[PDB]
Subunit: 338 residues, 6 copies
């Protein structure tokens, strides 16, 4: 998959495309409808399926540091796009271009001159051009006799509107199960494992993995979750009895760091039935279900007691998740008991 | 108007004065009664009308960093004093003098030796001398046969006590309309315009002006307000179609800056029907009425939609404010519609 | 009293001991039962009474910066231990030793090889060994025919379980009277006096003493308390009319410092009927009873008025405290009136 | 003078213009040669004289936070342009436009489509287009039969190249006299006066005005300088015996905060023979000549002794500056004697 | 390769081993002599080749935050050990164990009880036990009829001692060529690529990759270097015309943030003749030779001019590195011409 | 000794006094000449010997945060005054009083009305009144037939002027021996011992005591010094084989935190031939002579080697200090041999 930053980076010899346009944060089930529609048409006419997306978030251009939290990183947005059949992603920066353009010139410059599009696919909530003047209906009329337009209804399922907003709401509530249902996959984050408390191994109270994330990253509410930890493909040696590319059952503790930065987030993972230290590796953490709210501990005895209960409930939640094989990992480790 | 810092700075040849004493923060309608009384008497006897005020705030001397928020800056207190006819302001620093003085010596040193006062005007809540021992009644008896004393009742109107405390309460609640009613004018702040999001001009979502204020400055609660923006007199060039010394209709967004300083306040002004960038100018922002609480935005479409509604409600509120010509600006710009 | 950091520091020629083991934070009335039991047995057999305690807090080893607040400093834990008849304290660091040891090896290495113990005393909630596997019952069976074991019930009195947890709860609520009841003494902190507002002396609104404490120190909730201030023994000169080693009646204001560190705690003490400045001295502050919640002040008049009411209520609370001579200070200063 | 941010802000109404292009930082005597030629030609014909300038600095777009120090602020660059008869300034942001553009498209888009230029004036060092490809020669040949081009050699005078670089070098060395010679005026900074050491008045060692500047502001090397302080036009009252719009002789101390939130240069002004406090006013500080390097003081007698020597040297230096009228203030206060 | 944190993590199953002990920072050519001897002997017999190493650095246990800079990370030390045929690494924390131990108990506990060693290989400078008491000679005599001991002299080559100290000196001076000679490979760092100046692509002065390193990481002196950049194995899409696992010729700028939260060195890589943006990828940067010291730029034409000179020098230097095959990349991209 | 903050704290009861005036920072041998003369005269008559001193430093009132480093704290200045027989110290704050006062009003207000002085003793360099107008000669003539005045020349000894400046120079250079010669005692600092590297005990490279000082404290140049450490009188238990009120031979390492919240010098003390941990105690550290400059260590064997050399040099230096009794400790611990 090609990745182009700005209209100038797009190849001049691009001959034909089917294009979908949006922020696409989270690549949720509604987004997948737009992408599938685009990929299907591109196949039919022998063109490239192209995603036009935005970075920074369009809201951040107007309200710096008050944009919505990133459901995924830009890098994972690219990976997800590719996984659903996108051939090229054009990343637009509204501080550089296409902000003060009329709807008419937006279609002329982006869809025609740049992308040579014969088809465009957008959601019913699509807007474009200076001061948001263009709507999905504007697009239909401007494109008359120039390219075909598919405006897809926003996705409603089980009485819920599936949008980036609703996914962020679910994550903020700690309802990862609903977030996952809307995403069509387990919500996950990926990052390097750093040093934390002790070293991972025989001690149940030392995390197997410690990770930290910036304040722009959407994470579930502080608390403990059932999930799966995967060491991403690597030839680097691994301390302990975990193999790369296997999803290991884990109790995952999400927290925040007080006094200096009221939003520096940590993810501490306690891998079930394993003795390992993952310092230095890139690790994916998929969230499955909420186990409990955060609590303060008065003794090691109490801490370890609650730890063991988290493991018990995690084991039950994950055993059930496997049966929803569709979101479950292909290769996984989960013992029937300790 | 003369401004003296400390008793030592007062001219030795001062021959006669009528004096009022207090913090005078906000120069509200109650304060204006005291000042008017003082100016009237000074006129009658051919003396100077003098305000004795305090900086730092007397409370801050005892409780550093826990003094009440400044309704106005000291500089604006001076400007307001002058506007109501005060001929001289004596600024007293309680860390330097008059803190450990008996009520008797306070009158002897300040009113007589320093100010050569023939008349003094204070509120019913006036206190002075070491450990607040002197009251308004103490002042009356100490001044017997030495100078005349006018003790003015605290102002009650529409079931509300007008005090600096009540004004701060109204501002904290976002009730700028009540604050204004108590002040006898539009509550305002003034400051240099700095760079913010984008550049002011054609884009509706970029503020016309961005300003920042320190944590000691009383501002209305976070939210959006209807108000008037005035570029203070200047010969410096102005970017766009705003002229200096005209009050322009504006939607004003007051906010705070998270993580590092839970009280760094911003004021972002969106001037109605104008395309301008006010970087580098000193701008006055007068608040008229509350429009809405702060909210987070999920898209540019939503942001601009709410922006347009703020403009609509601001236009209605300001059209009404003009009819209260008494607080309304003398020279103003407000279009009937977009 | 000997203080040993780590098993290696214990003398090899130690011949016999009676040992009690625990965090002992606060040395509350339940802790005193264990210590008294240990000291009594050591006397009976002519052995040393030894306390095995832990620093850092065992919880902090697993959850750095999320351990419970220190009811006392380690230094005061030592002083309290000594006051109840302990002959030696062994301080164990779980990052160095005894964390990954089996219950069996824990008894062999610590109690036998290191301490040559003939008797051990623990609470019913005692746990030890890797992953908290050892309990009080484990200890009884492991020690069969090797040393005698006394497991003491946790202390319940007036429907309250006396534990470090319950004491911290009372302090957090500002219920110093209940905290004191559980501790068997006045809760106190000690530290050097630094510069604050003004200088202590004739001015009622300037504290006699200003102290600051780190975020790991348990202090009562923000507010005003009745208490006793003692200048610890010193030959350094004292500014004003306070003598060392006398408990002076005081109104004590506990506060926190906003914006940078949402937990930097201050203790400002206003000593009744005294004019003094305690800069540079080490001062003990004992808390007796809650007087009022924190409030913001709008004027010096109001501040001093509330100050005087605090003094009045403090005088009444302390006059009553003296009658509970058992917790009251041996040498004290408290005037019948101002 | 009009100020336009970006090409889209420029009136489509624009019929004809004489244009000059450059960073123009400092608007030094070399820059004035370019501006003079443009204004003359514009006056010759019926054309607007337009300056195209750049913000942020083009170097900072490549190397963020490694751009040269600003000899003046952008606001002062506008002020200076207007003073030399420029009718409009177009401010280009290279992160928005004219960056990836080739030399050929640059001339078409900027000079023809946007500015409708009949004449261009650029320096011999002028560069444009992608990867700095376009040059002075490339401009004469691109504009063939479209715009008359005037390329002006870089100014050499007294064996010294007058450039922004050269001016920054002089300032960095503390050689303000040479900087002024190159600039064609006294180097100056402007800004609000804040609270500092004590209050301005009768005491000599307390500044008349205290100002602080961010670290992007070019200032002379730390030290003491002879200069002029002017209170900018205002109707606000002035504490002391100074009036607005008069240049007062001052000894100016430039310093740096050893380590206070990084950044932050200080300018402290001691106005000769005046007793005033300029808190809250905007003041202009013009630098005439270096007096001495920074030094540390061990006593008050020593500090004041050197202070007195600073005033004596300043009187002499400022007398010569008035004698060398060309650069001196048109309306000034300078006593020959103390 | 196995990685064990502490002696208790080592399998009790371990029957036989050839062991080498040291900090092994950098795993330079002297270290490789020790490792080679251990691996050969292990291969000779039926034994595991084990490295005992130390984290944190033994100096930091005595002098926190005053330890030498890490030539490599601990993760890379593991990677290097594995590449030289080490079968297990035992990581010792001297704050946990083997610190107070005498030389005699060290050999019994570490080499016999834990590792069951038949052979030991140590440097002539090797020290162990309490207060650095044990030495190379003490090891040969302690292991009598237990373990065969091979003491290897410190490596001297070309009149230079090859040590971690010597390597750090070379790096600090910017002499990466000498560092590489001592290391037996190109010195490198690895890390995720982040957002930096603009986006990587057609523009030459914007880096292909931006990386930041903490202040514990040894890096070459600030300046420009010729090197190779490799995208580490990944299935993630790449923006631009670069492929993973190929070493691309690059000009590498090493810098320091003047004062940004302390710490933080930057490595900015400009890949020759490629237009790419490596945001989100893990990349390895190998340093071959010094090109120039840091310099400040006053114009874009000047910056790009020097940039072009940097590329020319880099081409020449990297051509020679490929000619000196031994150290060059096995699969690389380098154009002879621009 | 009495301590009075400000003239208003001085008893109105005061009938007669011999007074000396000065900053008295360090209370060096020149200061002792002034104090001795005052105490003798007070003893001669029936008068109190009074020191008038200044806090904050008079330089800091003019130049905040640019005052000289404190040779001692104000608390230690009180301690030293008392030790030389001063009966009262009056502390003057020049931001409160005696600043704007003329020389004539200074003598009337301070020496007559407040202190009722029959005798004054000042240095030849003495200055007072507004703008440093009053001098030594002006004092003899102002006090005519009121107070007998004794002006004492500044102390020159061994060709060196003994002044606070001279003492600070010696300290800054690391020449503590010369500083001690000028002071008439060992230069010292006092403060609480905190947690540092490991715990004090059997290990040689871990300090017996760790202390930190703010940046206003004069300390010797970074490096290693021979000195004496004394635990100040206490009934608190001591960990290890040290007793209070005995001066123990120590090697003292003075350092600076490279960049940790700014400020913060460290003093780490290694007590010879003792195994102790002084956490929580107040300790006095006396400096006798410089041993070596700071150096970085690359190994533990190297660190301990230099540590051992430091102890050897310290033994020799402290043996000579005991031989030069005059300055040595009256009760000390120093072994001739390790």
């Amino acid at each position: 998959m090609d990745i182009w930053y700005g209209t100038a980076a797009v190849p001049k010899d691009l001959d034909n495309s089917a294009v979908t346009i949006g922020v696409f944060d989270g690549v949720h089930r509604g987004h997948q409808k737009l992408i599938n529609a685009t990929v299907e048409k591109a196949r039919e006419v022998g063109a490239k399926a192209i995603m036009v997306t935005f970075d920074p978030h369009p809201v951040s251009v107007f309200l710096p540091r008050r944009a919505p939290l990133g459901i995924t990183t830009l890098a994972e947005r690219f990976a997800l796009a590719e996984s659903f059949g996108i051939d090229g992603v054009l990343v637009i920066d509204f501080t550089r271009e296409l902000s003060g353009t009329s709807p008419e010139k937006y279609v002329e410059f982006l869809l025609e001159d740049t992308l040579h599009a014969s088809h465009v696919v957008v959601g019913a909530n699509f807007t474009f051009g200076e001061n948001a003047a263009g709507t999905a209906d504007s697009l239909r009329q401007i494109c008359q006799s120039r390219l075909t337009v598919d405006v897809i209804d926003l996705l409603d399922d089980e009485g819920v509107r599936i949008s980036s907003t609703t996914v962020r709401e679910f994550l903020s509530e700690g309802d990862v199960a609903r977030a996952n249902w809307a995403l069509g996959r387990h919500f996950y984050v990926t990052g390097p494992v750093v040093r934390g408390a002790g070293r991972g191994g025989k001690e149940l109270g030392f995390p197997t993995a410690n990770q930290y994330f910036h304040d722009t990253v959407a994470l579930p509410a502080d608390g403990v979750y059932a999930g799966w930890l995967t060491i991403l493909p690597t030839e680097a040696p691994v301390s302990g009895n975990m193999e790369p590319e296997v999803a290991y059952a884990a109790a995952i503790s999400v927290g925040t760091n007080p006094t200096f930065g009221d939003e520096q987030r940590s993810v501490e993972s306690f891998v079930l039935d394993r003795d390992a230290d993952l310092y230095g590796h890139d690790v994916k953490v998929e969230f499955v279900d909420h186990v409990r709210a955060m609590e303060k501990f008065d003794s090691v005895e109490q801490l370890l007691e609650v730890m063991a209960k988290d493991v018990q409930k995690t084991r039950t939640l994950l055993a059930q998740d496997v049966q929803a094989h569709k979101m479950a990992p292909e290769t996984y480790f989960l013992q029937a008991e300790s």
